[PDB]
Amino acid sequence: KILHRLLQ
Amino acid sequence: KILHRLLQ
Amino acid sequence: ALSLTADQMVSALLDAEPPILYSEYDSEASMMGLLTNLADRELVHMINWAKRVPGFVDLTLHDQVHLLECAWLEILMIGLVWRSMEHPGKLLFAPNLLLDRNQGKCVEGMVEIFDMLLATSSRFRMMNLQGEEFVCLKSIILLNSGVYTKDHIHRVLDKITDTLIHLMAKAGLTLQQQHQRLAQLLLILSHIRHMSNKGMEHLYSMKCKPLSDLLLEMLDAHR
Amino acid sequence: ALSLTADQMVSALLDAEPPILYSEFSEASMMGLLTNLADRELVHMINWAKRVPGFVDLTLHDQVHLLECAWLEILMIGLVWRSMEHPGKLLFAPNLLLDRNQGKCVEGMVEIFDMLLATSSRFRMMNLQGEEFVCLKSIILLNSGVYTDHIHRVLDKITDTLIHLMAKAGLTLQQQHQRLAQLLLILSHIRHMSNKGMEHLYSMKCKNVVPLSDLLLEMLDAHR
Numbered sequence: 190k191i192l193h194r195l196l197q
Numbered sequence: 198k199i200l201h202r203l204l205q
Numbered sequence: 206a207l208s209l210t211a212d213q214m215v216s217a218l219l220d221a222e223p224p225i226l227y228s229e230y231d232s233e234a235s236m237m238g239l240l241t242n243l244a245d246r247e248l249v250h251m252i253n254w255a256k257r258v259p260g261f262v263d264l265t266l267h268d269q270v271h272l273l274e275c276a277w278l279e280i281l282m283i284g285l286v287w288r289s290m291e292h293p294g295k296l297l298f299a300p301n302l303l304l305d306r307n308q309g310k311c312v313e314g315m316v317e318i319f320d321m322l323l324a325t326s327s328r329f330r331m332m333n334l335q336g337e338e339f340v341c342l343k344s345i346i347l348l349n350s351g352v353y354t355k356d357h358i359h360r361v362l363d364k365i366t367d368t369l370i371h372l373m374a375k376a377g378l379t380l381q382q383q384h385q386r387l388a389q390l391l392l393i394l395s396h397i398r399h400m401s402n403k404g405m406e407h408l409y410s411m412k413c414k415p416l417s418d419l420l421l422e423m424l425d426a427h428r
Numbered sequence: 429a430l431s432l433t434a435d436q437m438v439s440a441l442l443d444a445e446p447p448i449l450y451s452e453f454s455e456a457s458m459m460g461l462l463t464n465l466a467d468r469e470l471v472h473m474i475n476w477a478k479r480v481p482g483f484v485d486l487t488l489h490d491q492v493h494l495l496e497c498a499w500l501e502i503l504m505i506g507l508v509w510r511s512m513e514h515p516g517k518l519l520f521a522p523n524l525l526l527d528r529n530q531g532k533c534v535e536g537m538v539e540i541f542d543m544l545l546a547t548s549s550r551f552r553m554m555n556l557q558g559e560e561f562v563c564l565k566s567i568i569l570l571n572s573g574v575y576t577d578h579i580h581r582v583l584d585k586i587t588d589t590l591i592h593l594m595a596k597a598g599l600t601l602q603q604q605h606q607r608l609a610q611l612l613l614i615l616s617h618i619r620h621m622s623n624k625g626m627e628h629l630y631s632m633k634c635k636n637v638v639p640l641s642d643l644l645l646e647m648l649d650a651h652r
């Protein structure tokens with residue numbers, strides 16, 4: 190999920 | 198509308 | 206209606222409570238049939254319950270219709286959730302119809318709604334929701350779900366807010382606790398609206414080839 | 429995050445505010461502008477969420493769930509807030525102020541506009557303050573997905589923060605919890621707009637009006 194990388 | 202009638 | 210004491214407000218809503226109807230329980234077509242039939246009969250009592258809700262009759266016929274059309278499933282859901290409070294992992298649709306989560310899988314797309322309903326019921330139990338608070342919340346749903354879609358309605362809503370505070374105060378809670386609990390209850394209504402929107406979309410998909418007329422108009426009201 | 433004072437909570441939320449972005453009329457064109465704008469705002473929303481007190485204390489899994497459920501609600505309450513001083517109009521961007529008739533360009537969007545315009549007028553009717561808005565938007569982030577204990581005590585803190593603001597503005601005890609209720613009940617309508625808005629975007633996807641970004645699709649697929 191792209192949302193994973195952006196949250197990190 | 199049935200609702201309008203049931204609301205008298 | 207605007208000169209009711211918080212205690213007078215409570216018992217007014219308590220007396221206005223609709224009865225708990227039974228099912229016809231002895232297949233996805235039968236399970237839906239039980240629910241559609243039960244909800245259709247409940248809708249008749251909800252209409253007469255709404256009239257006994259303070260301030261509702263003061264509105265116009267058009268405004269009465271609008272509020273019910275938008276909130277009818279919400280009110281059904283919070284009723285189910287409240288009845289199911291003492292039944293963990295099960296939804297008490299009727300005293301003779303206690304459905305399990307696994308039983309919800311009988312209908313495709315229903316189990317996801319069952320889970321949301323179970324969580325809401327579990328949340329009520331954790332908060333130890335009181336009956337006096339329940340009838341207040343259910344009346345709020347009636348007056349709030351379609352208000353912004355009058356100054357009298359918000360004036361009544363404020364009185365229900367005063368009532369909830371009055372209930373929590375006499376329950377011995379500190380005022381900090383009163384405001385916190387008040388917030389927690391009203392934030393649940395957001396999730397109840399969510400379940401309603403999802404549930405309505407599920408119902409509209411069941412209008413794709415045992416459904417009554419009144420229930421159809423309630424479904425058609427959401428386009 | 430729980431040791432924060434009411435004033436310190438307000439300041440933390442204010443400092444965390446994301447920037448107001450700009451935009452770059454037919455159905456494909458306006459949808460192109462909105463999807464582009466929404467994709468860029470989403471990047472700031474994620475970083476804003478991380479600056480919300482107690483949100484970093486959550487696991488990565490829970491952070492994802494809260495954002496996936498609330499992302500459209502957050503976009504809307506932001507739009508609604510910016511549109512307050514612009515009656516009858518919606519301020520998606522400073523160079524993109526739209527009225528309800530410009531919503532007829534895209535099929536099934538004018539219904540969403542009317543709900544959004546109604547929420548903004550309701551905000552102006554209550555004279556919503558910026559200190560209250562940042563609280564409501566943070567409440568949306570933490571509440572919307574909480575049912576699908578740390579979160580609930582952060583919510584209680586924001587509730588204490590909301591009351592503190594009202595008590596500061598000279599509101600009496602009765603006026604305080606009355607206003608608190610009116611504010612949180614609007615969140616029920618914001619959730620409603622989101623659900624109707626989420627279904628509309630899915631129909632735009634099925635109609636293939638404009639190619640959505642992979643991120644915007646992932647946020648959209650999280651609702652199915």
Ligand SMILES: Oc1ccc(Oc2sc3cc(O)ccc3c2-c2ccc(F)cc2)cc1
Nearest residue numbers: 240241243244281282285298315318404407
């Ligand atoms: O799959 C679903 C869809 C909507 C639902 O919403 C609810 S809550 C509730 C409580 C009752 O006491 C009686 C009916 C309901 C319903 C409901 C279920 C089916 C239907 F066609 C209409 C409403 C429930 C399950």
Ligand SMILES: Oc1ccc(Oc2sc3cc(O)ccc3c2-c2ccc(F)cc2)cc1
Nearest residue numbers: 462463465466503504507520537540625628
């Ligand atoms: O037809 C629609 C559908 C969703 C909508 O929700 C919102 S609110 C908002 C505020 C912004 O500052 C930027 C984007 C949005 C959107 C939105 C619009 C199109 C889209 F594809 C995703 C979100 C609005 C109109």
